[PDB]
Design a protein around this ligand. Structure first.
Ligand SMILES: NC(=O)c1ccc[n+]([C@@H]2O[C@H](COP(=O)([O-])OP(=O)(O)OC[C@H]3O[C@@H](n4cnc5c(N)ncnc54)[C@H](OP(=O)(O)O)[C@@H]3O)[C@@H](O)[C@H]2O)c1
Ligand SMILES: O=C(O)Cn1ccc(=O)n(Cc2nc3cc(Cl)ccc3s2)c1=O
Length: 314
């Protein structure tokens, strides 16, 4: 149920996602998740609900439902805080909101730094994101400091392509390797090349949007739908599982971590019931065959940033 990271710690391979969980619903979602066995929560400042996630964490700690050491809480540095002098404050605000004195894992949320200010996505008058002149290597050094200051136990990256991972791995004076790369991954974006690369370097990969993010705000009715794909339903039916359970078990059998989001108590519980069956090797290859290079998370306004990650092949 956990995977060993290159910092010596173990990470639960199933966690609860929180992007889009409404603030009025996410405290109960996180309390139910811990009650039915989740021990990893995926968070981010940019999701604007860390305070409410933190109320749930703190109540289950206070209630002695779980000990802090059994939890694995992940958050992410937003793009407007890549400047060396802003990274510690950004981490401390997340810590204060989550009511924690450390994070188990803190990620660079995207490789692109944006102009600092109140706006999460500062745009110029024609809608392009306004970059900052920070680069990923100085940001990485700032993340290493957080480990040395006790604020985080592990650091990692997210939405880094393989040349950007390689840039971190080849950073002069590198002190801590990234422990995780968290990337979009599901049967329509299988990521074989980038996962192989990261795993060969001992970097654990976390699969986000494993259900295809049906609640993403830019969904169009005509878009492909994993949960409604009859081929995936058929695999589910064969194992007497739901389609969501097959989509969650798939990355687990590729030695990935996976973080499905829900605020629906019944689905939170359903989504956790994925440790009592196995997809066959044939099932796994068939699921991989549905790759279409279809990406849910790739915002147009960011495509001209120098560090935009999805022009590269992987
Ligand atoms: N690093 C990054 O850049 C990044 C980017 C995107 C996502 N992520 C992380 O990954 C998490 C998961 O990705 P995501 O939120 O994009 O989408 P997701 O987990 O693929 O899909 C969540 C959607 O699926 C529905 N759902 C959940 N379980 C279901 C089930 N058993 N049956 C039917 N529908 C179900 C949820 O509905 P209800 O909630 O209404 O039940 C919600 O609409 C995020 O929440 C975030 O923590 C990270
Ligand atoms: O960031 C999250 O965890 C969730 N999320 C929320 C809103 C959204 O538009 N996106 C798509 C983005 N694409 C890029 C692309 C690049 Cl280069 C930087 C930032 C983003 S954000 C998104 O993924």
């Amino acid at each position: 149920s956990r995977i060993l990271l290159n910092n010596g710690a173990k990470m639960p391979i199933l966690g609860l996602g929180t992007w889009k969980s409404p603030p009025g619903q996410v405290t109960e979602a996180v309390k139910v998740a811990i009650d039915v066995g989740y021990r990893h929560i995926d968070c981010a400042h940019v999701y604007q609900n860390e305070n409410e996630v933190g109320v749930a964490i703190q109540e289950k700690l206070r209630e002695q439902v779980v000990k802090r050491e059994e939890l694995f809480i992940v958050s992410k540095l937003w793009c407007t805080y890549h400047e060396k002098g802003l990274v510690k404050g950004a981490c401390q605000k997340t810590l204060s909101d989550l009511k924690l004195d450390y994070l188990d894992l803190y990620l660079i949320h995207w490789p692109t730094g944006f102009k600092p200010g109140k706006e999460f996505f500062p745009l110029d008058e024609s809608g392009n994101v306004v970059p900052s002149d920070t680069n990923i290597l100085d940001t990485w050094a700032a993340m290493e400091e957080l480990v040395d200051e006790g604020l985080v136990k592990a650091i990692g990256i997210s939405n880094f392509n393989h040349l950007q991972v390689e840039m971190i791995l080849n950073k002069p004076g590198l002190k801590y390797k990234p422990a995780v790369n968290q990337i979009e991954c599901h049967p329509y974006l299988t990521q074989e090349k980038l996962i192989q690369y990261c795993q060969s370097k001992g970097i654990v990969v976390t699969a986000y949007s494993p259900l295809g993010s049906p609640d993403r705000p830019w969904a169009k009715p005509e878009d492909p739908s994993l949960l409604e794909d009859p081929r995936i339903k058929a695999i589910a039916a064969k194992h007497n599982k739901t389609t969501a359970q097959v989509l969650i078990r798939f990355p687990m059998q590729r030695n990935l971590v996976v973080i499905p989001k829900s605020v629906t108590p019944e689905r939170i519980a359903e989504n956790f019931k994925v440790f009592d069956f196995e997809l066959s090797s044939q099932d796994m290859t068939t699921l991989l065959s549905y790759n279409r290079n279809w990406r849910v998370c790739a915002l147009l306004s960011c495509t001209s940033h120098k560090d935009y990650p999805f022009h590269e092949e992987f």
